[model samples]
Target: VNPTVFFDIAVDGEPLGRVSFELFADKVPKTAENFRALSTGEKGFGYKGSCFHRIIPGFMCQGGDFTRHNGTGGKSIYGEKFEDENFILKHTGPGILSMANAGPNTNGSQFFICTAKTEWLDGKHVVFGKVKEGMNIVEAMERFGSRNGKTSKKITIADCGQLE
Candidate 1:
């Protein structure tokens, strides 16, 4: 069976909501492992204090840059870039969690949760997980701000663990 993970987020230092994702480890092992490890702080790249760095309306909410707090920084659990695990998945709807990279095979700790159907990202990004709950929270984060987004709001991951 696939494993489930949770992201307990806080905005502006207040409890925002929790978002759950069922990982596709079987389909994309390395990418999923990187995310799972990062989420649980096993790789020291945990998303605890990371903010949603990019929010494009009708597109997605991108974050997971636990290093620079911007899109330019973040490393894989391997301590560097890794090859792409382009599985047969598509970014067909909202709440889809996919890796955010500079280009193909540049997967790192950065990831994004789709707020809209980003079909154009289907083959370009690795779809390692799918949201199982907290779409409302995702929607709320989508409205958190636009363009460069709100950094002061602070989307912190209060906790993250396996769903059991």
Candidate 2:
């Protein structure tokens, strides 16, 4: 699925600009489907005033937990099938989007973006999209956490439609 989704980062009405991300639905179909499910209206990240919540500096940053009502987050292990390592690109710099999973192929709606160089996560996680804007805002959000802490500041993803 070659779909482009637009997003805005906000810390209480202050516009953090926009980010346009393209999803590689063909690479990881199940991951893509689950993301679409959350992004679209079928079932969602729960609310607009939600959050990415957890930021793990060198490793990764994550959120999109809808299982709990108060917006506590959770993620499945993998997607339907993990994409071939050859196809899954190595972790680049910031704004690199990848599927957040528990293990092999149990990914649900949970995902994350890269805020720093992450060479170690290279082959393990699936790279699906790149942040088209607002890397600085994401980095600022990263600062919202303590030294290796969970901030979960409200992160909302609007305009969840199909990938054209």
Candidate 3:
């Protein structure tokens, strides 16, 4: 794979190539390492057959559930909780990948991608990467118009080969 490979994250064969993430290990070590483990199918985690089950238009996209549900549900990991050291990147950019949690020190395997600029979510969630492609997919998911105005789109990463 090239330095920056284009990964296609899909939901039940629906091509969501429009949504992509650029991983970074320099900004946040714990967060980055954790994501790398999950993407690579290591750390007792697997994103394959997961879902992007939650969305907020002009805001963020979130998921990582075997059942395609939202929140901190599903399998949890043995790794201890992490803290964002510097908070280098804010949570107000399209394609921005950030962590999800019920409360402080409660993050497990849930993450999200920002589709719009939302500076308000900064200094809180742990951001490990940014979207490299498929912004449209996130946009579409955000406007799915569900009762909660949220769409449950599955995301399955075959492997972590994309990491360099």
Candidate 4:
């Protein structure tokens, strides 16, 4: 399998920028696989039109819940929740991509991209990948949106797939 993936972001159908990440497949295999499958539509659930539902200005931007358009709705590609791969990866700084879940072993289709240092989240979330490029776009996303749960104005993942 490929070691990385690429996701193209947009705002209301307009291109925002592209972000790429190297999957920690060896460390967090299940979490990485779930995200890869969802991003590529391999499991029939892609991240094409989902909004960044939760956006915290200095914290993170959350999204990938394509089922409910809100925060409390989403399922894994397998149609059920999966266990957390809370591996050794740590949340050191910005652009860290991690899973969003209710609690332990509840990882679903939701995820967040850190916009600033979030060390307190190190052991709580699965750090499956880190932003390899286009962090400026992530910063821009945080800059133009609100901090409330409905902060993401029109952020969407226009396209996402495994990077060669």
Candidate 5:
């Protein structure tokens, strides 16, 4: 079964809402578990305080760099980084979840939720999940993002964990 995880979002300390995602476990079990465990904070380090360091409007809202709180720093539960599980899922449209990386086979804690078609990223990034709920919050979060991969407001993952 696909496991669900959620992020309680807040902008500038103001609560926006929750965004829940269903990890495509059947297709990307390893990749999904990394995100699952990180959300649960099983490593004593999770994404709670990390802000969405990079955002590109009409593209995606990227985050998961809990260490540097920016796009540059990220570490996977498996290690500093993990290999690309697979590119079975294509970035054909919005609401898709894909790993963010510096280059090839560098998957880590960082991920992005697509806001529009990202067909160009197919075969380049591993798509492991999709929005199960809270698209409104996603759109609301997108409002804070700009063209230069910057958020107009501090969109933080105030809390996050696996859903029971």
Candidate 6:
């Protein structure tokens, strides 16, 4: 079954709201499992307090760097890195969730959620899920985003967990 998860977002240390995502396990099981396990903290490390280090307006916002808490770091549930599951899902519209990798077969814990249609990323990124609810919260987060993908205010996943 598809798994649902949520993130309690915050901006500049103030609570924005919660956003939910529905991972398409049937299309990309391993990819979904990585996100699910990380959210549930099935392992000791997780995305409970990670920052969304990169944010580009009208594009997408990225996070899940539980390691360095920035774009430069993250690790996979399987290992330090994992192969791209598949490109079965497309970056067709806003709210699409896709992995952020350094290159081919370099998927880690990092992922991005689209805020606008970005089909250009289809072949390169492994899309595993989408925002199921609370895109408004994401919209609020995007307001602080910049073209250079930096935000003066802190944008953090204040909390996160799986919901079956």
* RMSD (Å) per prediction: 1.5, 4.2, 3.5, 1.5, 0.8, 0.9
Which pairs of residues have clashing backbones in candidate 3? 18-133, 18-134, 19-134, 50-155, 51-154, 52-153, 92-118, 95-131
Clashing pairs for model 4 are: none
Q: In candidate 2, what are the lDDT values of residues 25-50, reduced to their tens digit?
A: 77755555555555554553432444
| CA-lDDT, candidates in order | 0.83, 0.59, 0.61, 0.83, 0.91, 0.91
Quick one: best lDDT, which candidate?
5
1-164 per-residue lDDT for model 4 (tens digits) = 54688878887779989988887888888888888888888877778767787787888989888988788888887666988766599888998999898988888999999888888887888899888888888887887567565664578888888888
Off by over 4 Å in 3: 1-7, 74-80, 84-86, 145-147, 152-164
- Expressed as tens digits, the lDDT of each residue in 1-164 for candidate 1 is 78888888888779989999989998988888888888888655577677777877678888888888889888888877888777588998998899999987898889999888889887889999989989888888877667656444666777887778
The Cα error of candidate 3 at residue 37, in Å, is 1.4
| Tens-digit per-residue lDDT, 1-164, candidate 6 | 79999999998789999999999999999999999999988798889888999899999999988888778889888999999888888998989999999999999899999999999888899999999889999988888889999976889988899876
Q: Backbone clashes in each candidate structure, one number apiece?
A: 1, 12, 8, 0, 0, 0
lDDT over C-alpha atoms for residue 110 of model 4: 93
Better of 3 and 6 by lDDT: 6
Clashing pairs in 5: none
Candidates' TM-scores? 0.93, 0.71, 0.75, 0.93, 0.97, 0.97
lDDT of 5 by residue, 1-164 (tens): 78999999999999999999999999999999999998999988878878998888899999999889878888998889999989899997879989998889898899999999999999999999999889889999998988898888899999999996
lDDT of 4 at 132: 87
Q: Give the TM-score (vs. native) of candidate 6.
A: 0.97
- Give the C-alpha lDDT of model 2: 0.59
